[PDB]
Symmetry: C4
Subunit: 136 residues, 4 copies
């Protein structure tokens, strides 16, 4: 149970580590801009409360879906279709980003070079010495 | 602001590069096809206003859903059952394409480029030293 | 456009390459067993046509959702809840499997060994010869 | 049948091993919590039959949906807006955990185990040959 708490503590730091990745934040910014963007629309087009809007906008981007309201106006169906698409666009972005070791490979390189350098320089001297010896 | 301004470019370029990927285009097409191919079926067999049939098609694929209309005809239900499977299929493929963070082919063979060099080099010196030692260990 | 056709041809082979992975097929088998499993249930419990069943079963596992019917009986809500969970269980399985190079690393090993072996054996002879020489 | 019989074991063991992973358990708990924590809110503030409030909670998180009931109160709507974000958050985490095919730590360091050996060996011979050559190239 100390286990539970200690783990959760690490995980929560990992989010914050991501939450300072520029790209992740662009996505969050885009999500929110798109979120209030829809609120602006369904509010002041499809005629709906500035909270009944946010509810449809969220229920739709996340693909849950309201069991009652849908776009009435044919204009409000066009938007919803293309909106939904920005949804997918976004959820694609995250899945890509949530699926990225690059640093472990840097150390391997930092050590393999230092090694391979010495291997070379050792071999070099050996050859240079076996040369000067097998003459004089 | 140093970052929010710039990264966007790189970000939009990053997925712009992904359009140039062919496998993505096929998935994006099979999408557009299945989608307008659905608008055809729902505008006729289930018989809905062109634009409305598109709406239902989108919503259904993206599993968003609609709290009002559902199929009536048994052909309209069997079709839908198969139509969601296609969406499953598509998204599976999309996920596969997106979940593999493969900038690693070019790294692991760009390693091998520099590696294979070193290997012939080391081996050459190993063979030289063996040949000169051989000759001196007789004379 | 020959491009289009030629690519699609490769992709479609890739599915078939997967469709002979044992694990993938277990998932498909499980999906289908679960699919008719629900059909059996909503048909002969919640009282629904043996096609109106398959439609609710599919619309629910895939998370679309019917806009009209939902489980009436409190028993049919219990199942649906836990069913939904087998859904997630499954869609987790696939995402894991759709996200797996193992063979490229085998060749690297097959070559690195043959190399490293020779490097060793070369170095070995050199030492053995420099030994017998610096005596007699 | 050679395969269908056996693999299941390995498959069920494979995810059985994943329960033993701690990070998964937290995600699985935050799940159970958020879920029964939702049944609490919808059984009161939105006021529904215990079991029914669970149903709505599940359905909503898993974005399945329900074509009938939706929130009425503004507290019941704001809550839901935040409740789906948690689902997003959770699933994001689940995906991250599941999408990384990391049996590669144990491989890349099991390489390094055998690699580091070879490296000291080669270096030792390199140093011996350099020392014996040094002594013989004076006497
Ligand atoms: Co000599
Ligand atoms: Na969904
Ligand atoms: Na839905």
């Amino acid at each position: 149970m100390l286990s539970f708490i200690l783990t959760l503590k690490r995980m929560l730091k990992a989010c914050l580590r991501a939450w300072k990745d520029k790209e992740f934040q662009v996505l969050f910014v885009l999500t929110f801009l798109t979120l209030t963007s829809g609120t602006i629309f369904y509010s002041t087009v499809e005629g709906l409360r500035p909270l009944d809007a946010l509810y449809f906008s969220v229920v739709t981007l996340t693909t849950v879906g309201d069991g009652n309201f849908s776009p009435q106006t044919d204009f409000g169906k066009v938007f919803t279709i293309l909106y939904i698409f920005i949804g997918i666009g976004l959820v694609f972005g995250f899945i890509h980003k949530l699926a990225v070791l690059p640093s472990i490979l840097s150390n391997r390189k930092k050590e393999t070079d230092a090694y391979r350098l010495e291997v070379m320089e050792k071999l070099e001297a050996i050859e240079k010495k076996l040369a000067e010896h097998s003459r004089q």
